[PDB]
UniProtKB/Swiss-Prot annotation, chains A, B:
Phosphorylated by PRKDC. Dephosphorylation at multiple sites by the PNUTS-PP1 complex promotes MYC stability by preventing ubiquitination by the SCF(FBXW7) complex. In the nucleoplasm, ubiquitination is counteracted by USP28, which interacts with isoform 1 of FBXW7 (FBW7alpha), leading to its deubiquitination and preventing degradation. In the nucleolus, however, ubiquitination is not counteracted by USP28 but by USP36, due to the lack of interaction between isoform 3 of FBXW7 (FBW7gamma) and USP28, explaining the selective MYC degradation in the nucleolus. Also polyubiquitinated by the DCX(TRPC4AP) complex. The 9aaTAD motif is a transactivation domain present in a large number of yeast and animal transcription factors. Residues 48-69 are annotated as: Leucine-zipper. It comes from Homo sapiens (Human). Transcription factor that binds DNA in a non-specific manner, yet also specifically recognizes the core sequence 5'-CAC[GA]TG-3'. Activates the transcription of growth-related genes. Binds to the VEGFA promoter, promoting VEGFA production and subsequent sprouting angiogenesis. Regulator of somatic reprogramming, controls self-renewal of embryonic stem cells. Functions with TAF6L to activate target gene expression through RNA polymerase II pause release. Efficient DNA binding requires dimerization with another bHLH protein. Binds DNA as a heterodimer with MAX. Interacts with TAF1C and SPAG9. Interacts with PARP10. Interacts with KDM5A and KDM5B. Interacts with PIM2. Interacts with RIOX1. The heterodimer MYC:MAX interacts with ABI1; the interaction may enhance MYC:MAX transcriptional activity. Interacts with TRIM6. Interacts with NPM1; the binary complex is recruited to the promoter of MYC target genes and enhances their transcription. POU5F1/OCT4, SOX2, MYC/c-Myc and KLF4 are the four Yamanaka factors. When combined, these factors are sufficient to reprogram differentiated cells to an embryonic-like state designated iPS (induced pluripotent stem) cells. iPS cells exhibit the morphology and growth properties of ES cells and express ES cell marker genes. It is linked to A chromosomal aberration involving MYC may be a cause of a form of B-cell chronic lymphocytic leukemia. Translocation t(8;12)(q24;q22) with BTG1. The modification N6-acetyllysine is found at residue 6. It is found in: Nucleus, Nucleoplasm; Nucleus, Nucleolus; Nucleus; Cytoplasm. The chain holds residues 381 to 454 of 454 of the full protein. Alternative translation initiation from an upstream, in-frame non-ATG (CTG) codon or a downstream ATG start site results in the production of 2 isoforms with distinct N-termini, shown in this entry as isoforms 2/3 and isoform 1, respectively. This is Myc proto-oncogene protein. Residues 3-41 are annotated as: Helix-loop-helix motif. It comes from the Eukaryota.
Length: 74, 74
């Protein structure tokens, strides 16, 4: 119904930090800023993934150095 | 413009993985899947942050062991 459409616009609006609980936010703004927010959080996801990849590489290098020194301690 | 409103529904649809871009999704379906996708991504972001925090701890523990061996090996 149209109750459900209004309800669903509110619920989407409220996952967008810039628009949460803004009673003056119109439909087209909610749709476009939601689309923008999805892209923005994907960008942040990519940064986190890159950070993990770097930490894993560092983890592997450290473990390699640890093994080398354990075998070279005398 | 209701032309812009329609375009904006479709552009949001296009960013939602579980909605096929070649299929005409109802308005409430687009809204609800967008909301679900944003919540799901935010949860995954928290999981990525926890992975990063664990890797940083693991890497500090490895550096600590490397320091101990450098100090105590011959
Ligand atoms: Cl409106
Ligand atoms: Cl519809
Ligand atoms: Cl609908
Ligand atoms: K609310
Ligand atoms: K040595």
């Amino acid at each position: 119904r149209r109750n459900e459409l209004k309800r669903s616009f509110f619920a989407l609006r409220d996952q967008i930090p810039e628009l949460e609980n803004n009673e003056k936010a119109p439909k087209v703004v909610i749709l476009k800023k939601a689309t923008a927010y999805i892209l923005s959080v994907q960008a942040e996801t990519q940064k986190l993934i890159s950070e993990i990849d770097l930490l894993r590489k560092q983890n592997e290098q450290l473990k390699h150095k640890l093994e080398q020194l354990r075998n070279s301690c005398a």
